[PDB]
Coordinates of C-alpha atoms in Angstrom, one line a residue:
Chain A
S1 CA 22.1 -14.7 3.0
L2 CA 20.2 -11.4 3.0
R3 CA 17.6 -13.5 4.8
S4 CA 19.6 -14.8 7.8
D5 CA 21.4 -11.5 8.2
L6 CA 18.2 -9.6 7.9
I7 CA 16.3 -11.8 10.4
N8 CA 19.2 -11.6 12.8
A9 CA 19.1 -7.8 12.5
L10 CA 15.5 -7.9 13.5
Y11 CA 16.4 -9.9 16.6
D12 CA 18.3 -6.9 18.0
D13 CA 10.1 1.1 21.6
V14 CA 7.3 3.7 21.3
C15 CA 6.2 6.2 23.8
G16 CA 4.0 8.4 21.6
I17 CA 3.9 10.9 18.8
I18 CA 6.1 14.0 19.1
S19 CA 5.5 17.5 17.8
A20 CA 7.9 20.2 16.7
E21 CA 7.5 21.8 20.1
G22 CA 8.7 18.6 21.8
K23 CA 5.2 17.8 23.1
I24 CA 4.5 14.1 23.2
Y25 CA 1.0 12.6 22.9
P26 CA 0.7 9.0 24.1
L27 CA -1.0 6.4 21.7
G28 CA -2.0 3.4 23.9
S29 CA -3.2 0.5 21.8
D30 CA -6.0 2.6 20.4
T31 CA -6.6 1.2 16.9
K32 CA -4.5 0.7 13.7
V33 CA -1.8 3.3 14.3
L34 CA 0.5 0.4 15.5
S35 CA 0.9 -1.2 12.1
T36 CA 2.2 2.1 10.7
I37 CA 4.4 2.5 13.8
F38 CA 5.9 -1.0 13.1
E39 CA 6.7 -0.6 9.5
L40 CA 8.6 2.6 10.4
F41 CA 11.1 0.7 12.7
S42 CA 11.6 -1.8 9.9
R43 CA 12.3 0.4 6.9
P44 CA 15.8 1.4 8.2
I45 CA 16.7 -2.3 8.9
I46 CA 15.4 -3.7 5.6
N47 CA 17.5 -1.0 4.0
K48 CA 20.9 -1.5 5.8
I49 CA 21.0 -5.2 5.2
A50 CA 19.9 -5.0 1.6
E51 CA 22.6 -2.4 0.8
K52 CA 25.2 -4.6 2.5
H53 CA 24.3 -7.3 -0.1
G54 CA 24.0 -5.3 -3.3
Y55 CA 20.1 -5.3 -3.2
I56 CA 17.8 -2.6 -4.4
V57 CA 14.7 -1.9 -2.3
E58 CA 11.5 -0.2 -3.4
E59 CA 8.1 0.8 -2.2
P60 CA 4.6 1.2 -3.8
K61 CA 4.8 4.8 -5.1
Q62 CA 1.2 4.0 -6.0
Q63 CA 0.4 3.8 -2.3
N64 CA -2.0 0.9 -1.7
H65 CA -0.1 -1.9 -3.6
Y66 CA 1.6 -5.2 -2.7
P67 CA 4.2 -5.7 -1.1
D68 CA 5.7 -3.2 1.4
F69 CA 9.2 -4.1 0.2
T70 CA 10.5 -5.3 -3.2
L71 CA 14.1 -6.4 -3.2
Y72 CA 16.4 -7.5 -6.1
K73 CA 20.0 -7.6 -7.3
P74 CA 20.3 -5.4 -10.4
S75 CA 22.2 -8.2 -12.3
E76 CA 19.4 -10.7 -12.0
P77 CA 16.5 -8.2 -11.9
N78 CA 13.9 -11.0 -12.5
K79 CA 14.1 -12.7 -9.2
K80 CA 12.3 -10.3 -6.8
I81 CA 11.6 -10.7 -3.1
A82 CA 8.3 -9.7 -1.5
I83 CA 8.5 -8.6 2.1
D84 CA 5.3 -7.7 3.9
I85 CA 5.3 -6.5 7.5
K86 CA 2.3 -7.7 9.5
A87 CA 1.6 -7.1 13.2
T88 CA -0.7 -8.6 15.7
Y89 CA -1.3 -8.3 19.5
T90 CA -1.5 -10.8 22.3
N91 CA -3.3 -10.2 25.6
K92 CA -1.9 -13.3 27.1
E93 CA 1.8 -13.9 26.7
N94 CA 2.1 -17.6 25.6
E95 CA -1.3 -17.8 24.0
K96 CA -1.8 -18.6 20.3
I97 CA -2.0 -15.6 17.8
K98 CA -3.3 -14.7 14.4
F99 CA -2.3 -12.5 11.4
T100 CA -4.0 -11.3 8.2
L101 CA -2.0 -11.7 4.9
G102 CA -3.5 -9.8 2.0
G103 CA -6.2 -10.4 -0.6
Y104 CA -6.6 -13.6 -2.6
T105 CA -9.0 -12.2 -5.2
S106 CA -6.4 -9.8 -6.8
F107 CA -2.8 -10.5 -7.7
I108 CA -2.9 -14.1 -6.6
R109 CA -5.8 -14.7 -9.1
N110 CA -5.1 -12.0 -11.7
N111 CA -1.3 -11.7 -11.8
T112 CA -1.1 -7.9 -12.2
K113 CA -3.8 -6.0 -10.3
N114 CA -2.6 -4.3 -7.1
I115 CA 1.0 -5.3 -7.1
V116 CA 4.2 -3.4 -7.7
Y117 CA 5.6 -5.8 -10.2
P118 CA 3.9 -8.8 -11.8
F119 CA 3.5 -11.7 -9.4
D120 CA 5.4 -14.1 -11.8
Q121 CA 8.5 -12.1 -11.1
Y122 CA 8.6 -12.5 -7.3
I123 CA 10.3 -15.8 -6.3
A124 CA 9.8 -15.3 -2.5
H125 CA 7.2 -13.8 -0.3
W126 CA 8.5 -13.1 3.2
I127 CA 6.5 -11.9 6.1
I128 CA 7.8 -10.0 9.1
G129 CA 5.5 -10.3 12.0
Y130 CA 5.4 -8.5 15.4
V131 CA 3.5 -9.9 18.2
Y132 CA 3.3 -7.2 20.9
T133 CA 2.0 -7.8 24.4
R134 CA -1.1 -5.7 25.0
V135 CA -1.2 -3.6 28.2
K136 CA -2.7 15.4 28.2
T137 CA 0.8 15.4 26.8
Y138 CA 4.2 14.8 28.3
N139 CA 7.8 16.4 28.2
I140 CA 11.0 14.9 26.8
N141 CA 11.8 14.2 30.5
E142 CA 8.7 12.1 31.0
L143 CA 9.5 9.2 28.6
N144 CA 9.3 6.7 31.5
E145 CA 5.7 7.5 32.5
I146 CA 4.0 7.9 29.2
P147 CA 1.3 5.1 29.0
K148 CA 2.7 2.7 26.5
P149 CA 0.4 0.7 24.1
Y150 CA 2.3 -2.5 24.9
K151 CA 5.1 -4.1 26.9
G152 CA 7.1 -6.5 24.9
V153 CA 7.6 -7.0 21.1
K154 CA 8.4 -10.2 19.2
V155 CA 9.3 -10.6 15.6
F156 CA 9.8 -13.4 13.0
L157 CA 10.6 -13.7 9.3
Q158 CA 8.9 -16.5 7.4
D159 CA 7.7 -17.1 3.9
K160 CA 4.0 -16.2 3.3
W161 CA 2.7 -19.6 2.3
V162 CA 4.3 -21.4 5.2
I163 CA 2.2 -19.5 7.6
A164 CA -0.9 -19.0 5.5
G165 CA -4.0 -20.6 6.9
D166 CA -7.1 -22.0 5.3
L167 CA -9.7 -19.4 6.5
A168 CA -10.4 -15.9 5.2
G169 CA -10.5 -13.1 7.8
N170 CA -8.0 -11.1 3.1
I171 CA -6.2 -14.3 4.0
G172 CA -6.1 -15.3 7.6
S173 CA -2.8 -17.0 8.7
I174 CA -2.6 -20.2 10.9
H175 CA -3.8 -20.1 14.5
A176 CA -0.6 -21.0 16.4
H177 CA 1.9 -20.0 18.9
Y178 CA 4.8 -17.6 18.3
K179 CA 7.1 -20.7 18.0
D180 CA 5.1 -22.3 15.2
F181 CA 5.6 -19.1 13.1
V182 CA 9.3 -19.1 13.7
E183 CA 9.6 -22.9 13.3
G184 CA 7.6 -22.7 10.1
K185 CA 4.9 -25.2 11.0
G186 CA 2.0 -24.3 8.8
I187 CA -0.6 -26.6 7.2
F188 CA 0.1 -26.5 3.4
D189 CA 2.5 -29.0 1.9
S190 CA 3.8 -26.7 -0.9
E191 CA 3.3 -23.1 -1.9
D192 CA 1.9 -24.7 -5.0
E193 CA -0.8 -26.0 -2.7
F194 CA -1.3 -22.5 -1.0
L195 CA -1.7 -20.7 -4.3
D196 CA -4.2 -23.3 -5.6
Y197 CA -6.4 -23.3 -2.4
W198 CA -6.6 -19.5 -2.4
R199 CA -7.1 -19.0 -6.2
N200 CA -10.0 -21.5 -6.2
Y201 CA -11.6 -20.1 -3.1
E202 CA -14.9 -19.0 -4.6
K203 CA -16.5 -26.5 -3.1
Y204 CA -14.2 -26.5 0.0
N205 CA -13.9 -24.4 3.1
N206 CA -10.9 -25.9 5.0
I207 CA -7.8 -27.9 4.1
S208 CA -9.2 -31.4 4.7
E209 CA -12.1 -30.7 2.4
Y210 CA -9.8 -29.1 -0.1
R211 CA -7.4 -32.1 -0.3
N212 CA -10.4 -34.3 -0.9
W213 CA -11.6 -31.9 -3.6
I214 CA -8.3 -32.4 -5.6
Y215 CA -9.5 -36.1 -6.0
Chain B
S1 CA -24.5 23.0 22.8
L2 CA -22.2 19.9 22.4
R3 CA -21.7 21.0 18.8
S4 CA -20.5 24.3 20.3
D5 CA -18.3 22.9 23.0
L6 CA -16.8 20.6 20.4
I7 CA -16.1 23.0 17.6
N8 CA -14.7 25.4 20.3
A9 CA -12.3 22.7 21.5
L10 CA -11.4 21.7 18.0
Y11 CA -2.2 19.2 15.1
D12 CA 1.5 19.3 14.6
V13 CA 3.3 16.0 14.6
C14 CA 6.5 15.3 12.8
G15 CA 7.7 12.0 14.1
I16 CA 7.2 9.1 16.5
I17 CA 9.4 8.8 19.6
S18 CA 11.2 5.8 21.0
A19 CA 11.9 4.8 24.6
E20 CA 15.6 5.4 23.9
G21 CA 14.7 9.0 23.0
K22 CA 15.1 8.5 19.2
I23 CA 12.6 10.1 16.8
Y24 CA 11.4 8.4 13.6
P25 CA 10.2 10.8 10.9
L26 CA 6.6 10.2 9.8
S27 CA -4.7 10.1 8.4
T28 CA -4.4 7.8 11.3
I29 CA -2.8 10.7 13.2
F30 CA -5.9 13.0 12.8
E31 CA -8.1 10.1 14.0
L32 CA -5.8 9.8 17.1
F33 CA -6.0 13.6 17.7
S34 CA -9.9 13.8 17.6
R35 CA -10.5 10.9 20.0
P36 CA -9.2 12.5 23.2
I37 CA -11.0 15.8 22.3
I38 CA -14.3 14.1 21.3
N39 CA -14.4 12.2 24.6
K40 CA -13.6 15.0 27.1
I41 CA -16.4 17.2 25.8
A42 CA -19.0 14.4 25.7
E43 CA -18.3 13.3 29.3
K44 CA -18.9 17.0 29.9
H45 CA -22.4 16.5 28.5
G46 CA -23.2 12.9 29.6
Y47 CA -22.8 11.0 26.4
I48 CA -21.2 7.6 26.2
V49 CA -18.9 7.3 23.2
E50 CA -18.4 4.0 21.3
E51 CA -16.1 3.2 18.4
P52 CA -16.8 0.4 16.0
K53 CA -15.8 -3.2 16.6
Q54 CA -15.2 -4.0 12.9
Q55 CA -13.8 -2.5 9.7
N56 CA -16.0 -0.4 7.6
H57 CA -18.7 0.5 10.1
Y58 CA -20.4 3.8 10.4
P59 CA -19.6 5.8 12.4
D60 CA -16.1 6.4 13.8
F61 CA -17.8 7.7 17.0
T62 CA -21.4 7.1 18.1
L63 CA -22.6 9.2 21.1
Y64 CA -25.7 8.9 23.3
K65 CA -27.4 9.5 26.6
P66 CA -28.3 6.0 27.8
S67 CA -31.9 7.1 28.5
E68 CA -32.4 8.2 24.9
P69 CA -31.0 5.5 22.6
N70 CA -32.8 6.8 19.5
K71 CA -31.0 10.2 19.7
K72 CA -27.4 9.2 19.0
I73 CA -24.9 11.4 17.2
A74 CA -22.6 10.0 14.6
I75 CA -19.3 11.6 13.9
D76 CA -16.8 10.9 11.1
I77 CA -13.2 12.0 11.1
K78 CA -12.4 13.1 7.6
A79 CA -9.1 14.4 6.3
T80 CA -7.7 15.5 3.0
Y81 CA -5.1 17.9 1.4
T82 CA -4.3 20.8 -0.8
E83 CA -1.0 24.3 -1.2
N84 CA -4.3 26.2 -0.9
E85 CA -6.6 25.4 -3.8
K86 CA -9.6 23.3 -4.9
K87 CA -13.1 17.6 -1.7
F88 CA -13.9 14.7 0.6
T89 CA -15.7 11.4 0.3
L90 CA -18.5 10.4 2.7
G91 CA -19.0 6.8 3.8
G92 CA -21.2 4.8 1.4
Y93 CA -24.5 5.5 -0.4
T94 CA -25.4 1.8 -0.8
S95 CA -25.6 0.6 2.8
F96 CA -27.1 1.9 6.1
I97 CA -28.8 4.8 4.3
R98 CA -30.9 2.5 2.1
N99 CA -30.8 -0.4 4.6
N100 CA -30.7 1.1 8.1
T101 CA -29.5 -2.1 9.8
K102 CA -26.4 -2.7 7.7
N103 CA -22.8 -1.6 7.9
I104 CA -23.6 0.7 10.8
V105 CA -23.3 0.3 14.6
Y106 CA -26.9 1.3 15.3
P107 CA -29.9 1.4 13.0
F108 CA -29.6 4.6 11.0
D109 CA -32.9 5.7 12.5
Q110 CA -31.3 6.1 15.9
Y111 CA -29.0 8.8 14.7
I112 CA -30.6 12.2 14.9
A113 CA -27.5 13.9 13.6
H114 CA -24.4 13.0 11.5
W115 CA -21.2 15.1 11.5
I116 CA -17.8 15.2 9.9
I117 CA -14.6 16.6 11.5
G118 CA -12.5 17.8 8.6
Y119 CA -8.8 18.3 8.4
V120 CA -7.3 19.8 5.3
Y121 CA -3.5 19.8 5.6
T122 CA -1.0 20.5 2.9
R123 CA 1.5 17.8 2.0
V124 CA 5.2 17.8 1.1
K125 CA 17.2 8.1 9.2
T126 CA 16.3 8.8 12.9
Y127 CA 16.9 12.0 14.8
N128 CA 17.0 13.1 18.5
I129 CA 15.5 15.8 20.8
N130 CA 18.0 18.4 19.6
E131 CA 17.8 17.4 16.0
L132 CA 14.0 18.0 16.4
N133 CA 14.4 21.2 14.2
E134 CA 15.9 19.4 11.3
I135 CA 12.9 17.0 11.0
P136 CA 11.1 17.7 7.7
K137 CA 7.4 18.1 8.4
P138 CA 4.9 15.7 6.9
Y139 CA 2.3 18.5 6.1
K140 CA 2.4 22.3 5.8
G141 CA -0.4 23.9 7.8
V142 CA -3.6 22.0 8.9
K143 CA -7.1 23.3 9.0
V144 CA -10.2 21.9 10.9
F145 CA -14.0 22.0 10.7
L146 CA -17.2 20.2 11.7
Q147 CA -20.4 20.2 9.6
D148 CA -23.2 17.8 8.9
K149 CA -23.0 15.3 6.1
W150 CA -26.0 16.7 4.1
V151 CA -24.8 20.3 4.2
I152 CA -21.6 19.4 2.3
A153 CA -22.3 16.6 -0.1
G154 CA -23.3 16.3 -3.8
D155 CA -22.1 14.9 -7.1
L156 CA -20.6 11.4 -6.8
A157 CA -17.7 9.2 -5.9
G158 CA -14.7 8.7 -8.2
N159 CA -17.8 5.9 -1.2
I160 CA -19.8 9.1 -2.0
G161 CA -18.0 12.4 -2.6
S162 CA -18.8 15.7 -1.0
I163 CA -18.6 19.0 -2.6
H164 CA -15.4 20.4 -4.2
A165 CA -15.2 23.8 -2.6
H166 CA -12.9 26.0 -0.4
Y167 CA -12.6 25.2 3.3
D168 CA -17.5 26.9 2.2
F169 CA -17.4 23.7 4.4
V170 CA -17.4 25.8 7.6
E171 CA -20.1 28.0 6.0
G172 CA -22.2 25.0 4.9
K173 CA -22.2 26.3 1.3
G174 CA -23.4 23.0 -0.3
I175 CA -25.8 22.2 -3.1
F176 CA -28.7 20.2 -1.3
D177 CA -31.8 22.1 -0.1
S178 CA -32.3 19.8 2.9
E179 CA -31.5 16.5 4.6
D180 CA -34.5 15.1 2.9
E181 CA -33.1 16.1 -0.5
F182 CA -29.8 14.8 0.5
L183 CA -31.2 11.3 1.2
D184 CA -33.5 11.7 -1.8
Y185 CA -30.7 11.4 -4.2
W186 CA -28.4 8.9 -2.7
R187 CA -31.1 6.4 -1.9

């Protein structure tokens, strides 16, 4: 399985940005730089495991476009995997955390807008999450002093719908603990249910209401 | 002159470095570069800086002397690219400028100045400290400027597009006659 191999490759970080002159600038939990920093560590991994399974990998040449990684065996080109990399922080190790998962007004509702390949062609939508515990340049010899943005990184690979939640922030994911994301304990019964909730989200506001609405 | 001190004080990065010494080859970066500089000069003048607490909120940096809240300065870190040739975008012309209390940190009427810090670069496996030379750069050459929003703004988006001139920007060379004509166009 590309999937079990892949996730077990993720199971086994940043000091700052480095210049050509070897000068290092710390980053320290200041803003969105950490999502770009996270996808960077993953690109190599997604690539070695795919290759060792005969899978192509691809990225949105047209920059802003879903998903970060499109995978597929040339033989059966029509079954494509969507792999998005999301990241979130936790100030308290062992507290519940949240993620954002992409828009619901575009490709989930249109089919073609803002996606690398048409939605109908992807058979799986995986999510790679990192939960990192929140906590004048430097030399190459100062790596162990440079004020790090976080201390501890956790990752999980889970299908998108499984962890999707019922509240917008751009879809918000469930509000659970690291374990619930790994375990796969979301709130939707089927992905059919997840698609229908988010496509019709113009009646209902949360899952109870929703399920009543389908009556 | 905080505009002076700032400009005076006002970019080569080719990778991110890991704890294990490894280096990963590469607009958030320029953001990250300005922050440290913006703050050291302002503390040198007595301004408290404040970033936004939500996406899409003007401005990137609001600065003020606590005793004069209606004399805050807004700064916007803007960055684009060329190799040497022929344009930025400038927030939105629908919100805080016609509203005042929307999509902005403070009411537009508290800002007695708006600026833009512009960076115009030129575009184009892991390595280690010795391999540092072999790391292909992300951008060839980087230029920087600060100028008000009204001095370099004009036609339309295609946000709200600035002029399409040659790094002019530092000289002001824009098309509007004043900041009243600037607003009286986009409003």
